[model samples]
Target: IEEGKLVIWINGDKGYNGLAEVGKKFEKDTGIKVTVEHPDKLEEKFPQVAATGDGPDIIFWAHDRFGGYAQSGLLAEITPDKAFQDKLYPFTWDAVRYNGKLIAYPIAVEALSLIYNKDLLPNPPKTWEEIPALDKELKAKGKSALMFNLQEPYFTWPLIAADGGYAFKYENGKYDIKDVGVDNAGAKAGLTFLVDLIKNKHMNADTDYSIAEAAFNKGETAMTINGPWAWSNIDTSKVNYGVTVLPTFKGQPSKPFVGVLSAGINAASPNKELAKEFLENYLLTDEGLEAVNKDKPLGAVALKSYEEELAKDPRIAATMENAQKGEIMPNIPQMSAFWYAVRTAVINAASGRQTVDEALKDAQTRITK
Candidate 1:
């Protein structure tokens, strides 16, 4: 066993870079070198490597993937006590769990929100009705308004769920995958509202994520739907942006999908106790959280008790606010099949190849069968 060094493998430069900073403090305090590694294609690499019992001491990534990892016996089961679990956003805790077992320690959370250009528009619309008026005003000035990916369920689910549509009915502490509700009446209403926006030019069914990002970064769009992770990807220097909760849609709050980034111990690791202590006491601490967010690559700290102090950054407060109203992205591996089916429905419906009802029914059938 490696006694003086603890290793973690997370994907990409953005997240692991900030972890490197947090590792330094842990190193100073515990005399342990926290080696933070960022390898490409982390999602693929992690499962393949962990299956061989040769992954790092810690696997840092999204909570969604860990459900499978937990079942595969790749991740150590971590049951955080109530007090420690109570400190984080409730959804963060929920996302890390699989069949009542906490498989990871949530470090940060990301949820979609309305980000607007302050220079072009002083304030964002507060209600769905206000958007049409704002669109007219922006168009007269030759400015583009709001946009996000219309074909992907990641962007569209917020709308459906806001109006009472859900992919799977979560019941009695478990997701009722047998009961699919993506095409319920309320979901249709939400999707209808989305189509209405397209008719009025407030959104484009064809606007994929990269296109929306490019438009926003180029300052062509006055407002867009995104999350705090956009902070690092966006060109904030060119556009004066403000992050805020999404506008109400027909008296319903637009609750977006929330995704959590967490760290789980390698089940085969000999240093399980030290790994958990480092995560709970060092990485999840307020000071450690601030260090993680110093680079603004990771989103708001999932341990929300640290928010009031960390929210001086504004984006932190905005994302945390949205995260409160957000629905946790389902951690079950079955969600991938659901995602593909629903995405196909969204794209078909949005492209006018099929009606909302038709697309949704087809999606439901695909998932149920």
Candidate 2:
């Protein structure tokens, strides 16, 4: 209700977590005072406050919540044109649509990718078949070719889903939960690739994220699977590395699970039009993307036009390219079962406790149960 002002609540700590400088810039450009606040338990409180039309004009949260919020009529609808939409990554648009209506604008996307030390391997392997030779060379050097949290499905799904195993797909608002394809032949084959590496000592069964990360930093491992958040350590060590898309499995393309962080206006906000302009005009622009990266480099930006500009950081460049083959994680209610089953299945298969076929079959039954 205040004149010439807009409020945004970001669920981060108060100390310039991100967006403070961006907010200042937005204020200067639009003559509207932009207040970015860090409210306590913002995610839990958003639905309650927003339903009463008393929440902030804009809020930034993960895309997984877009379905629930938009269905509750808590989001102000946005109409982004084809020209503007064309500038952004493709799958991100599918995240916030409900009943053919768009409800949010994506700012950042988190994707898993490969980071390799250029010194150890100048050319990273492009497919699983190439890894054996690379592994032999590294083994001879007393180093491992690649390492990551082998037991964790989130980190392994990139290669696991490569040959046709897929997370549930949602397009234009359709839900078919009858067959959640976790144990398909392609998925089983993908899991076997990881199992072979673990059993043959090409990678560690206990690598986990921290151990794998430490190995790469100490130069004991040539490469690792990680997200953009992994860059800070490599930068601190001044490591000679290049970020890249994960190698394919048996000639099939690798795909990573991507999560988007997006901002949306509240349906009850009186400044709805101004909020749209802030997202579509200010925050979605090239300048806006740069502001966010300067603030925190959340991950690969959602804009196609901004990719090359951010190439000074290979993590961003590689992830943006990887996202072309990325699969957006579905937030359907049934996802809970799949997550529970897959985590157990990946760990079981990787540790040799269960045959790959047995682990995957159990996982499939649990999800469909």
Candidate 3:
């Protein structure tokens, strides 16, 4: 019941060891009793915590869940005084702002980029259409051109963006869930492009992202499109590796879903004022930023810090460029249906289970539900 005591819940897999260290630093700097707890599933854990009115002062999770939280009134509004808000990036702060009230604090931002082998393919393709042709060229040379994990939705997101199709249209400063962008002519072409890749045998179902990444790292395959997480998957012993900005499709750029893994004040917390102070003093400091970047390497959500670190690594540099090019996935309600349904469409289109039209039709229909 003391002031300046904050209990935070986070996902602390070894990859995010920085979280705990930051908590300790926060406690030491402010004489605050900061406690950190890891959750198996923070989203599911929230309701249980709320039901009993006993929960951590803060919870960190993906922005995808923001829609539901804002709807159910399960999270508290971020009522930081004007001074604290000014120090954060405009985009980072905006991403967490809902209906004029800020909710979550963005911690990390990431985007998709292309990874290719230097020895196997001397030059990287700059356009989406070129990918299929490059694959054909590779196969003609008795090699595979590019590979994607078709079973997952993340891999197919670029196609939807390429075709100018969207699960939910952003308009008038809000996500218009009513419009199904997949039905647009550009989206149709994007879906067809995917079908072309599969039917033409330019890429293979047997070769997943893991294989594509392994092949590229081992100098066996030409290229693959993925997120910055691929950095850990590369094999240094392989050929000279390079990453390219995700290419544009039909003159439209490929935009990946940018995630702002963030923390929010729990609505059910026993102490709200103390929680806010801990957040401003500890989680958003120079020390906190360095810890996050050290663990994940691209943790800062602001454009300036991100750009500075990105230029040093070829892979992240390309990712940073593409990140600036893509659309921000909306943190709106009913967004879940968009991802689950659109992902299903992408799988069907990529795997040849359904014609492009049929797959798109399914995608468009799901948004209504």
Candidate 4:
């Protein structure tokens, strides 16, 4: 193999199409063979394939899964130079590291933002208190203030996190899983606020993603909190809309879980050096970043230069702005437990099926167990 050859497994056409363009450039410039594959359920299938050293030399997936993969010895340690690292956003690195070792190169970042219909509500609320006032204004015009998937914890977690609630505390620059805060006093306060919204007839406890989407598109609700994935489905021509970071809960910031899509090296691959070269020289370069962004203009790319380019689109700009206000989604394996625990607490508390304290206490117990 005089000229190094590598294969990469990515989620879908978004990554594959964009990176394929980069691969062609890599082959022309470096005389290296680069191939990208779109695998079904790559996240769930990768561990078994990578364990036997038969998987692609590189894998592109979400940052949240990196911890478990690195622990399982499926991802290689990435040691890019300090100068090369300087080009990435500081927050992007939070998800790239596992146990103090850099494990992946962040490709793009995403988080939920407040998407509001401009016709019913000219402005998004600046604080949770404003929601009630907006509700009254919308009601006078035969519309609701806002609607979201109240039962889905992913959509509800930001509210719970706004008032200082966290799945795990980051102490001394590291996530300390021992300090789980899913059911803390602050969490209870945030959840209670949501319950109040439901009780005030401002929101429905039964609202799910479909219901929220239908209501928002039909102008039944003035707003909904969702991510970029939902952007395409919104009939923009019919519903004049705008997007912005979520409103603060009371006075505290409402931080969503900012998830990053990153590229990781296969620890078992024989072509580690070549894989690194392909990533750093071809994919991480300005040209490579733009190619990828063109195919999948979903989130904010980690590169500042590319970010400015993407900001040309107001939708991309708002999504990136929302991510700036978020907490990086923790990639620790314990997060699996956190998801199960918090979902229960959020549903029970929001539905008034359990008292806030009872629901939260139960969540804490589940996480600890």
The regions of model 1 sitting more than 4 angstroms off are 1-5, 15-18, 21-33, 200-202, 233-237
Angstrom error at residue 249, model 3: 0.9
Candidate 1 C-alpha error for residue 100, in Å: 1.5
Clashing pairs in 4: none
User: How many clashes show up per model?
Assistant: 0, 0, 0, 0
lDDT of 2: 0.80
Candidate 4 lDDT over 63-125, as tens digits, reads 989889988988988899988888888888878888788899998888898999988777678
The lDDT values for all models are 0.79, 0.80, 0.70, 0.84
Per-residue lDDT of model 3, residues 1-369, tens digit only: 323587777776523567667777766766776777777886787877665666777887876677577666777987767776666555566567665667877766677778777878787888877777677677787778777676565776776667576666664436676876866777788778777777777766556666776666666677777776666667554466787877778888886666666678877776787777666666576666667667756433553544465467666666656666666667786777777887777777767688788987887887875
Pitting candidate 3 against candidate 4, the one with the higher TM-score is: 4
- TM-score (C-alpha) between model 1 and the true structure: 0.91
TM-score of 2: 0.91
* Residue pairs in clash, model 1: none
Could you give candidate 2's per-residue lDDT for residues 229-304 as a string of tens digits?
7788898877898888788887878888888887888888888788877777777778777766676666677777
Weakest ten-residue segment in model 2 by summed lDDT: 13-22
Badly placed stretches (over 4 Å) of model 4 are 1-3
For every candidate structure, what is the RMSD over all alpha carbons to the true structure, in angstroms? 2.3, 2.5, 2.9, 1.7
Per-residue lDDT for 300 in model 2? Answer: 70
